[PDB]
Amino acid sequence: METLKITVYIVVTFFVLLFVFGFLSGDPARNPKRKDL
Amino acid sequence: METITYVFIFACIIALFFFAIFFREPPRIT
Amino acid sequence: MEVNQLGLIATALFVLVPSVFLIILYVQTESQQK
Amino acid sequence: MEVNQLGLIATALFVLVPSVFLIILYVQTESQQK
Amino acid sequence: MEPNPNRQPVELNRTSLYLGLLLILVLALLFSSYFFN
Amino acid sequence: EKLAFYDYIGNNPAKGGLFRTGPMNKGDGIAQAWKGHAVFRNKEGEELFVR
Amino acid sequence: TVLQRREQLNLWEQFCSWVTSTNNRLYVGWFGVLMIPTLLAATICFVIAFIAAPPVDIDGIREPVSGSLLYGNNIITGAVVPSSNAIGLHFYPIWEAASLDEWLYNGGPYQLIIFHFLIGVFCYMGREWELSYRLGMRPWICVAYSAPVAAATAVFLIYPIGQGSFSDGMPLGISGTFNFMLVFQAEHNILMHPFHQLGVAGVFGGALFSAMHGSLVTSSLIRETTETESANYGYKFGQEEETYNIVAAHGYFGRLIFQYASFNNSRALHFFLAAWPVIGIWFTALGISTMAFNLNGFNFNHSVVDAQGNVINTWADIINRANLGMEVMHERNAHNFPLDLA
Amino acid sequence: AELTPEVLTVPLNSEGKTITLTEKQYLEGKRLFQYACASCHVGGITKTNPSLDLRTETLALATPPRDNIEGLVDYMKNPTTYDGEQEIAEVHPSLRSADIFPKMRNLTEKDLVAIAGHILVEPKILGDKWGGGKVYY
Amino acid sequence: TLTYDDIVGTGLANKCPTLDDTARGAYPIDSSQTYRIARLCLQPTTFLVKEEPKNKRQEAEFVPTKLVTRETTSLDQIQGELKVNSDGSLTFVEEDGIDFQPVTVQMAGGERIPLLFTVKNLVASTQPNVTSITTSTDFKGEFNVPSYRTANFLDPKGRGLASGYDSAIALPQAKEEELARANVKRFSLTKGQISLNVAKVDGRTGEIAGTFESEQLSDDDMGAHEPHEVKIQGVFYASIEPA
Amino acid sequence: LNPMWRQGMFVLPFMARLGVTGSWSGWSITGETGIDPGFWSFEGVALAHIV
Amino acid sequence: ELVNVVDEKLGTAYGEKIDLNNTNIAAFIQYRGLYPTLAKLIVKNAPYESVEDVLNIPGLTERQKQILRENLEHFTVTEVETALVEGGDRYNNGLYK
Ligand code: CLA
Ligand code: CLA
Ligand code: CLA
Ligand code: CLA
Ligand SMILES: CC(C)=CCC/C(C)=C/CC/C(C)=C/CC/C(C)=C/CC/C(C)=C/CC/C(C)=C/CC/C(C)=C/CC/C(C)=C/CC/C(C)=C/CC1=CC(=O)C(C)=C(C)C1=O
Ligand SMILES: CCCCCCCCCCCCCCCC(=O)OC[C@H](CO[C@@H]1O[C@H](CS(=O)(=O)O)[C@@H](O)[C@H](O)[C@H]1O)OC(=O)CCCCCCCCCCCCCCC
Ligand SMILES: CCCCCCCCCCCCCCCC(=O)OC[C@H](COP(=O)(O)OC[C@@H](O)CO)OC(=O)CCCCCCCCCCCCCCC
Ligand code: HEC
Ligand SMILES: CCCCCCCCCCCCO[C@@H]1O[C@H](CO)[C@@H](O[C@H]2O[C@H](CO)[C@@H](O)[C@H](O)[C@H]2O)[C@H](O)[C@H]1O
Ligand SMILES: CCCCCCCCCCCCO[C@@H]1O[C@H](CO)[C@@H](O[C@H]2O[C@H](CO)[C@@H](O)[C@H](O)[C@H]2O)[C@H](O)[C@H]1O
Ligand SMILES: CCCCCCCS[C@@H]1O[C@H](CO)[C@@H](O)[C@H](O)[C@H]1O
Ligand SMILES: CCCCCCCS[C@@H]1O[C@H](CO)[C@@H](O)[C@H](O)[C@H]1O
Ligand code: OEX
Ligand SMILES: [Ca+2]
Ligand SMILES: [Cl-]
Ligand SMILES: [Cl-]
């Protein structure tokens, strides 16, 4: 159960970090019109 | 036999989802 | 569980007969001259 | 008579599945251009 | 996608339909007694 | 009892039928217990054996 | 270490470009990065539990309720059963149980499913915003979808929180849904609550307006086909011209009622089609979410009294008799004291 | 049906003397009963002890008898258990414990008489519904 | 030393107090003075259930089980008279306490066995001539095992003993004799047995601790099916005081 | 007296032949209780084949 | 055969009077002077071989004994029924209004 807990914690942290750094990576500029936001 | 029947129908529905999305008639502008 | 003994064939034919009707119509549409 | 309770659906699908296969194939042959 | 050159049309003429339905129905008439047992 | 149960023709695989479907338990039943070894004797007390 | 950071940085940018690509068959996006694993986890656990989970002690009284198909249910009676009342609002992941057998007895699957499901649909809502931004659309489809999201959140999260137990969240099943509705009426008189009445106007009206709009556009399609063709072939995907005569449609509807009851402005009309059901569902979601804190439907029990002081019953009092029947019977082994206070 | 002087005539004491309440008295008693008592005694039951109700037949068998104005007024000053053996002002609102049950403060003799009259009149109007609980709703 | 907030959520609240390894003393008994057990605690560590074989001659064994109702199993705050008998033996007479817990354990293969783990109305006695309680003192006794559900409990079709329907109302014209065992609820009352093996004694404080083994029947679902035989092993703690 | 071959089991003996003998529910085909098969129980084998 | 023991008890004096060995304590409210003081003493000191044994409860006052004698006509005794006395049901049997 301990191994499963640590595994899930890592898995969740992984996806949440992708989400956060993803939206930090100049997301306003990812659109078809004014890409200089 | 009942459980098999319910799960069979469900599984056919999931398969249908797959074909309806990935093997749809492609929308085409003419 | 003591289910109706005809429930299985009722459900199978309910699925099979109209599905087959549609499949017949679809395939013979695809095979028509395009 | 105390017959096998799956005998009915076994016989029904034995007839229907290959018969439907043949009907699908026949009808889509007829609908091909002549 | 570019079309697959190996496709071929399939046919079942009417006589073959009748022959096949006869085979299936007679096989059913034969084996059904054993399915009911 | 496991050894006695092997010495019983209902577990012989050459006793079935092509359309006798399902588990062996559907035929003779679900085996519960060995009844014990039957010894037959006549009125003179000679031991007799069933063919 | 030197330019290696730039080989890592462009690789990150390639990943960002793929995640946010307008050319994936299914849009991924940053919301999709959270949505995809949580919906898959919830779906997989739900399917396995619906087929095979053993009975669950929903009300914490060692009285396990069977929800799965293999344990004697059909499609209509089956459910994934809410977690035990002994757990209450405590967080009960797999690793808090001594065993999977314990986790199953106590309704662990329910919590795993609803929490992943709710993350998933909140991210599905964010994803609807995100793709509209990538496509150069206006942004508010996600606002319409916030109505079903609010409603799901009310029955799986807000109501359990107010009542102090996920054992009172809506079960994941067809008959379990009806059980939730009946007990809700007994304990909150939701039928007499104006937010549920708005909900009904929202869905009755949405269905009415769907049929109305559908019939009026269909009624005024321009002839582009013969009688042996489906009229649907008279429209070609992406054509510039409108496919029906909205002047004809308005001329019909304006005479059906009167001229000024009919929309001639297609944008006003389609805003109305959006707003009516969406607002109705917002209010009914708020109904569940505020009856979660026991501000309940109107209570006119014994409101009408004659000159001597005898109660003169109204239809509200007959409703009360039905509510009492459900109240006294529900969870027949769970109450030891005279008031059902949650 | 009407709220008549006969309906409003209730036993004053255990010796058979009656009193005829005014319609104003009854309505004040009903208002005061809601103000200080209905949180536990709505409809003549007792939420924190459902074994004891406010039916006249029950009050008649209490010790001392509570099926009359003076008995009920005495109860609101110095409540006892059903057998009269223990004084329960520490856990039941009364004039004696108005310091800890502040809604009893400023209640006059007339107020207690009105509350008592309401309790005796209400079953004459409602019958078994008074003290009946949800079965009778 | 520990407070509720130190303990809450840890599982320690389901554990009985323990004694140090140094507690191997002797608690003197004065035959002229009366005694009581001020607190008896029983913490089960193993639930075994006797298998029910098909062969009526294969000796059945107690097999291990999985607890599925979490850390809700211990008996505690039990008190009663500790009598000094003519022969110097002691007899504990249980008077009150949290002396039962419903418990569900699961056999291999999934079968759930609910039981009312209990020492209700325990009377347990030592050997004679117990002039002091030592790590050689033992208690043996019997207790009552009442029905796992009490008389108001209603089955899923609303049938019960002191309440509920008395028939299968969803089968209005079915024959009733075949459903009698499900329709007519019965209230079980059986006997259990327990042994307490004292392993530690604090002679100064009157505290003792050790292991127990108890045997009793499981839930019979108000007569609907045969109960199973259960063996419970665990640890115990007791504080003795003059009364 | 009720082993797999009396019960019409066809793939169970093939899993057992190569060392899969326990269920996640705690039993083993040799009659043990409280065994831990790890992932590779009969159920884990079945799941692996579905995936 | 199989018998519901509570329904059976309704055919005895338990169904007609307050059974000092079985009836739930709220029934003592039916008569003057019995609840709660005597009712508690009666339930605690049960069972009784005959109704008159209720007069021998240790510690009764002289007035309490007089009150009990006045109410013996409303009492009965039958054999203790486990289903009615387990669960603390004589003190709270799950019935309110
Ligand atoms: C190698 C193949 C194989 C074998 C040896 C087994 C063996 C077994 N199966 Mg499994 N099974 C299999 C494949 C197999 N199965 C497949 C592919 C499926 C999916 C359909 C199943 C689904 C299945 C189920 C649901 C069950 C079994 C059960 C069993 C047991 C009973 C078998 C029985 O009664 O058969 C009966 C065999 C027959 C009646 C023979 C049929 C002969 C056909 C009809 C002849 C057709 C002739 C044809 C039409 C001629 C055309 C002529 C034309 C060319 C001119 C036995 C251990 C049973 C069991 O006990 O489970 C615990 C059981 O309930 N099996
Ligand atoms: C998007 C991926 C994702 C997310 C968000 C979750 C979320 C959850 N999982 Mg699931 N899971 C996933 C994928 C995910 N899972 C996958 C791929 C698997 C298969 C390996 C699982 C297998 C699994 C199991 C078997 C179980 C869970 C459980 C849970 C719940 C507890 C998790 C926890 O304690 O984390 C620990 C918390 C952290 C690690 C926090 C670190 C993250 C950052 C630093 C902080 C985030 C929180 C904060 C509010 C910031 C939010 C930012 C926001 C703007 C995005 C939670 C609902 C449990 C459950 O459902 O309980 C009922 C459970 O038993 N998961
Ligand atoms: C003729 C039958 C009839 C009528 C007139 C109504 C009418 C109503 N129902 Mg009921 N209902 C019915 C049958 C009917 N119902 C049946 C058979 C069932 C199932 C048994 C229900 C179940 C039901 C539920 C559960 C609820 C209602 C509710 C309502 C109210 C809102 C309905 C709504 O928005 O629909 C959608 C229709 C529209 C959005 C179009 C507008 C409709 C309005 C009412 C017409 C206005 C006319 C106007 C005042 C006239 C002026 C003329 C002008 C030219 C001067 C409305 C009073 C709700 C309620 O009670 O709220 C208080 C509610 O919660 N209905
Ligand atoms: C004619 C009578 C009538 C009518 C018209 C209604 C109508 C309604 N009731 Mg009321 N009710 C009634 C009688 C009625 N009721 C009676 C008699 C009782 C007492 C027995 C009740 C007690 C009651 C309760 C307790 C509740 C309702 C609620 C509702 C609303 C339910 C629909 C909804 O919330 O959509 C909103 C949309 C959703 C809930 C969908 C969420 C979708 C999520 C986000 C995604 C799901 C994806 C899915 C899993 C997979 C999709 C497929 C896949 C292939 C992609 C609707 C307004 C519910 C409500 O107000 O909820 C807020 C509610 O909780 N009613
Ligand atoms: C025997 C005797 C005496 C006989 C005499 C008979 C006689 C001659 C009488 C004449 C005198 C006379 C008429 C007297 C009248 C008496 C009288 C008042 C009777 C009462 C009748 C009455 C109350 C009727 C009520 C009708 C009623 C409630 C109407 C409400 C209308 C209503 C709620 C409308 C909803 C408003 C709204 C915005 C709806 C939009 C819905 C929708 C989706 C539209 C979609 C849509 C709209 C478009 O617009 C176009 C374009 C397209 C594309 C499209 O999608
Ligand atoms: C017991 C648990 C077991 C679970 C195990 C699950 C693990 C799966 C691993 C295998 C993955 C392969 C599958 C790919 C299928 C696919 O979508 O391709 C379709 C395209 C093709 O990929 C495209 O592929 C192209 C290259 S090529 O086609 O591969 O050559 C490439 O050009 C393009 O960028 C790329 O997008 O992929 C995409 O459009 C982008 C990713 C799609 C995101 C998937 C969404 C899943 C949501 C689930 C929500 C709940 C579902 C329940 C509802 C019933
Ligand atoms: C698990 C799911 C499995 C699903 C399987 C579904 C499909 C299986 C069924 C296939 C059936 C095929 C039948 C084809 C039938 C058919 O097409 O025949 C005619 C066919 C003629 O073929 P030709 O080469 O002339 O091509 C014409 C084309 O149009 C055919 O596609 O010959 C054959 O197919 C050879 C086999 C002949 C068999 C003939 C037997 C007829 C005799 C009647 C016997 C009964 C009476 C006996 C009296 C005693
Ligand atoms: C809840 C907190 C209560 C409020 C507020 C009031 N009463 Fe009460 N009442 C309550 C209890 C628990 C009991 C039973 C006490 C016991 O142990 O005997 C009672 C009893 C009475 C009675 C006696 C009823 C009988 O049949 O003998 C009377 C007459 C009574 N209560 C009147 C009363 C009035 C007038 C109140 C408002 C001023 C009132 N009660 C408040 C609980 C509570
Ligand atoms: C729980 C986690 C907490 C994290 C807290 C973060 C604190 C702030 C640290 C910011 C780190 C992210 O730093 C951010 O990364 C991405 C990729 O590397 C950079 O680069 C991004 O922006 C540029 C400019 O729009 C885009 O052209 C480019 O496509 C994109 O990759 C951002 O310009 C930088 O600002
Ligand atoms: C439960 C029982 C289920 C049994 C199901 C059996 C399904 C069998 C499916 C048969 C599929 C036939 O596949 C079909 O072949 C025909 C030719 O034969 C193709 O048709 C193609 O050839 C023809 C003839 O030259 C052209 O006129 C046509 O324009 C061209 O598309 C179809 O594009 C294809 O859809
Ligand atoms: C994809 C695998 C699905 C897991 C199947 C359910 C868990 S495993 C399942 O549990 C049952 C009850 O304990 C047992 O009776 C049975 O023998 C066992 O196979
Ligand atoms: C698809 C879900 C996969 C779940 C994985 C659970 C691993 S479980 C783990 O596995 C080991 C290897 O078999 C065993 O030795 C060990 O005893 C067991 O606990
Ligand atoms: O859990 Mn489901 O239900 Ca909400 O109230 Mn209280 O708790 Mn139970 O009773 Mn009524
Ligand atoms: Ca020892
Ligand atoms: Cl319920
Ligand atoms: Cl309660």
Q: Which two tokens stand for residue G276?
A: 């009516």
Alpha helices in A1-37 (DSSP H): 2-24
Which residues are paired to H96 by β-bridges? none
Nearest CA in chain I to K9: I162
Smallest CA-to-CA distance from G332 within K96, K87, I163 is with: I163
CB I163, CB I152: distance < 8 Å: yes
Which residues are paired to I84 by β-bridges? I90
Does an H or E element contain K68, and which? helix K62-71
Nearest CA in chain E to D5: E36
The domain ranges of chain I are 21-149+186-243, 150-185
Nearest CA in chain D to C20: D20
DSSP class of residue I8 equals: T
Please report the atom of ligand 1 found closest to the CA of residue D14: 49
CATH topology of domain I150-185: photosynthetic oxygen evolving center fold (3.30.2050)
The domain ranges of chain H are 1-137
Would the annotation count G270 as a binding residue?
yes
Does an H or E element contain B7, and which? helix B2-22
DSSP string computed for chain H: ----TTTTEEE-STTS-EEE--HHHHHHHHHHHHHHTHHHHGGG--TT-TT----HHHHHHSSS--SSHHHHHHHHHS-B-TTS-SB-TTTS--STTTTTSGGGTT--HHHHHHHHHHHHHHHHHHGGGTTT-GGG-
I153 with G333: Cβ contact below 8 A: yes
- Indicate the SS3 state at residue J51: coil
Label residues I5-44 b or e (16+ Cβ within 10 Å = b): eeeeeeeeeebbeebeeebebebebeeeeebbbbbbbbbb
DSSP class of residue F3 equals: H
G280 C-beta neighbours (distance < 10 Å), count:
23
Integer Rg of chain K from CA: 13
CB G89, CB G161: distance < 8 Å: yes
**CA dist., res. J28 & res. D24, Å (int):** 49
Tokens 């089991």, residue?
J9
Kindly state if the Cβ of J17 falls inside 6 Å of ligand 1: no
**CA dist., res. H47 & res. H41, Å (int):** 7
Q: Which two tokens stand for residue C31?
A: 């095979």
**CA dist., res. K80 & res. I187, Å (int):** 13
Pick from F5, F9, F12 the residue to mutate for testing the J interface (most J CBs within 10 Å): F5
For Cα atoms I16, I21, I22, give the angle at the middle one, nearest 5 degrees. 120
DSSP class of residue K26 equals: G
Q: Looking at the complex, report in whole angstroms how far the Cα of residue I151 sits from the nearest Cα belonging to chain K.
A: 6
Range of the domain at G86: 3-192
- Asked whether the bond before H64 is cis by omega within 30 degrees of 0, the reply is yes
SS (H, E, C) G22-58: CCCCCCCHHHHHHHHHHHHHHHHHHHHHHHHCCCECC
Residue type at G56? V
For residue K63, give every residue at least 6 positions away whose Cβ sits within 8 Å of its Cβ, in sequence order, or none: none
Q: What are phi and psi of J45, to 5 degrees?
A: -60, -45
Smallest CA-to-CA distance from I233 within I43, I28, I33, I39 is with: I43
Enumerate the residues of chain H whose CB falls inside 8 A of the CB of residue G311.
126, 129
Smallest CA-to-CA distance from I79 within I41, I118, I40, I43 is with: I40
- For chain E, say whether D15 makes contact (Cβ under 8 Å): yes
CATH number for the domain that contains residue G11: 1.20.85.10
Strands annotated E in chain K: 18-19, 75-76
DSSP class of residue E4 equals: P
- Indicate the SS3 state at residue I182: helix
Residue type at B18? F
Residue K5, Cα to own-chain centre: how many angstroms?
17
For residue I159, give every residue at least 6 positions away whose Cβ sits within 8 Å of its Cβ, in sequence order, or none: I165, I166, I167, I168, I182, I183, I185
For residue H41, give every residue at least 6 positions away whose Cβ sits within 8 Å of its Cβ, in sequence order, or none: H33, H47, H54
> What is each CA distance from I197 to I46, J50, K41, in whole angstroms?
16, 53, 38
Q: Looking at the complex, report in whole angstroms how far the Cα of residue G327 sits from the nearest Cα belonging to chain H.
A: 11
G207 C-beta neighbours (distance < 10 Å), count:
11
Kindly state if the Cβ of G262 falls inside 6 Å of ligand 5: yes
**How buried is I203 (Cβ within 10 angstroms: 0-12 exposed, 13-18 middle, 19+ buried)?**
middle
CB G164, CB G294: distance < 8 Å: no
**Subunits close to I (at least 3 CB pairs below 8 A):** F, G, J, K
Q: Which two tokens stand for residue B4?
A: 């098999």
Pick from G14, G16, G28, G132 the residue to mutate for testing the A interface (most A CBs within 10 Å): G16
Q: Which two tokens stand for residue H24?
A: 């104003």
For residue C14, give every residue at least 6 positions away whose Cβ sits within 8 Å of its Cβ, in sequence order, or none: none
Please report the atom of ligand 4 found closest to the CA of residue G149: 44
G99 with I104: Cβ contact below 8 A: no
CB E13, CB D29: distance < 8 Å: yes
Task: Using most ligand atoms within 8 A of CB, pick from G48, G56, G99 the residue to mutate for ligand 11.
Answer: G48
SS (H, E, C) chain C: CCCCCCHHHHHHHHHHHHHHHHHHHHHHHHCCCC
**CA dist., res. A37 & res. A32, Å (int):** 11
Q: Which two tokens stand for residue I125?
A: 């006695």
Q: Which two tokens stand for residue I131?
A: 């002039």
Pick I21-149+186-243's CATH classification: 2.60.40.10, 3.40.50.300, 2.40.160.30, 2.60.40.1260: 2.40.160.30
CB K27, CB K36: distance < 8 Å: no
**CA dist., res. G39 & res. G27, Å (int):** 15
Which E residues in the span 1-37 are in contact with D, Cβ-Cβ below 8 Å?
A: 9-14, 16-17, 20-21, 24-25, 27-28, 31-32, 35-37
Range of the domain at K11: 1-86
Which residues are paired to I191 by β-bridges? I144
**CA dist., res. I208 & res. I136, Å (int):** 11
Which C residues in the span 5-34 are in contact with D, Cβ-Cβ below 8 Å?
A: 5-6, 8-9, 12-13, 16, 20, 23-24, 27-33
CB I121, CB I81: distance < 8 Å: no
> What is each CA distance from G158 to G4, G46, G149, G170, in whole angstroms?
49, 21, 12, 11
Kindly state if the Cβ of J19 falls inside 6 Å of ligand 12: no
Would the annotation count H118 as a binding residue?
no
Please report the atom of ligand 4 found closest to the CA of residue G184: 25
**CA dist., res. I93 & res. I124, Å (int):** 7
CA of G334 to the centre of ligand 15 (A): 10
Smallest CA-to-CA distance from G176 within G89, G242, G114, G115 is with: G114
For residue I34, give every residue at least 6 positions away whose Cβ sits within 8 Å of its Cβ, in sequence order, or none: I81, I84, I242, I243
- Asked whether the bond before K36 is cis by omega within 30 degrees of 0, the reply is yes
Smallest CA-to-CA distance from I229 within I83, I93, I81, I65 is with: I65
CA of I45 to the centre of ligand 9 (A): 55
- For chain K, say whether I45 makes contact (Cβ under 8 Å): no
Which residues are paired to I169 by β-bridges? none
**Subunits close to A (at least 3 CB pairs below 8 A):** G
Going edge to edge, which strands form the sheet with I112-118? I66-67, I100-106, I112-118
Smallest CA-to-CA distance from G297 within G268, G319, G266, G312 is with: G319
SS (H, E, C) chain G: CCCHHHHHHHHHHHHHHHHCCCCCCCCCHHHHHHHHHHHHHHHHHHHHHHHHCCCECCCCCCCCECCCHHHCCCCCCCEECCCCCCCCCCCCCHHHCCCHHHHHHCCHHHHHHHHHHHHHHHHHHHHHHHHHHHCCCCCCHHHHHHHHHHHHHHHHHHHHHHHCCHHHCCCEEHHHHHHHHHHHHHHHCHHHCHHHHHHHHHHHHHHHHHHHHHHHHHHCECCCCCCCCCHHHHCCCCCCCCCECHHHHHHHHHHHCCHHHCCCCHHHHHHHHHHHHHHHHHHHHHHHHHHCCCCCCCCCCCCCECCCCCECCCHHHHHHHHHHHHHHHCCCCCCCCCCCCC
CB H82, CB H52: distance < 8 Å: yes
Residue I77, Cα to own-chain centre: how many angstroms?
13
- For chain I, say whether K96 makes contact (Cβ under 8 Å): no
Please report the atom of ligand 3 found closest to the CA of residue G197: 64
Rounded-to-10 torsion of CA G152, G157, G159, G165: 140
**CA dist., res. G282 & res. G275, Å (int):** 10
DSSP class of residue I133 equals: E
> What is each CA distance from D31 to C22, C25, D17, D25, J45, in whole angstroms?
15, 10, 22, 10, 47
CB B28, CB G237: distance < 8 Å: yes
**CA dist., res. G19 & res. G127, Å (int):** 12
DSSP class of residue I115 equals: E
Method by which the model was determined? X-ray
**How buried is G170 (Cβ within 10 angstroms: 0-12 exposed, 13-18 middle, 19+ buried)?**
buried
Does an H or E element contain J49, and which? helix J42-50
CB K5, CB K81: distance < 8 Å: yes
D33 C-beta neighbours (distance < 10 Å), count:
7
DSSP string computed for H99-133: TTSGGGTT--HHHHHHHHHHHHHHHHHHGGGTTT-
Q: Which two tokens stand for residue G270?
A: 């389609």
Closest to I146 (Cβ–Cβ): which among K6, K86, K94?
Answer: K86
| Angle between helix A2-24 and helix G29-52 axes, rounded to 10 deg | 150
Q: Provide the residue count of chain J.
A: 51
Kindly state if the Cβ of J43 falls inside 6 Å of ligand 11: yes
DSSP class of residue F20 equals: -
Smallest CA-to-CA distance from G20 within A19, B27, A17 is with: A19
- Indicate the SS3 state at residue I188: coil
Closest to K4 (Cβ–Cβ): which among I181, I185, I189?
Answer: I185
Q: Which two tokens stand for residue I121?
A: 């109305």
Q: Which two tokens stand for residue I85?
A: 């008998």
Smallest CA-to-CA distance from G150 within G128, G122, G110, G191 is with: G122
For residue I107, give every residue at least 6 positions away whose Cβ sits within 8 Å of its Cβ, in sequence order, or none: I49, I63, I65, I113, J26, J33
CA of G330 to the centre of ligand 15 (A): 4
CB I135, CB I199: distance < 8 Å: yes
CB G93, CB G141: distance < 8 Å: no
Does an H or E element contain K40, and which? helix K37-44
Q: What's the total number of domains in chain K? A: 1
**CA dist., res. G147 & res. G121, Å (int):** 11
CB K63, CB K34: distance < 8 Å: no
Kindly state if the Cβ of G208 falls inside 6 Å of ligand 3: yes
For residue I93, give every residue at least 6 positions away whose Cβ sits within 8 Å of its Cβ, in sequence order, or none: I80, I81, I83, I122, I123
Rounded-to-10 torsion of CA H42, H45, H48, H50: -160
For residue I236, give every residue at least 6 positions away whose Cβ sits within 8 Å of its Cβ, in sequence order, or none: I16, I40, I41, I42, I43, I196, I209, I210, I211, I212
Q: Which two tokens stand for residue K65?
A: 């004994």
> What is each CA distance from H82 to G292, H65, K35, K39, in whole angstroms?
40, 9, 6, 11
Q: Looking at the complex, report in whole angstroms how far the Cα of residue I108 sits from the nearest Cα belonging to chain J.
A: 4
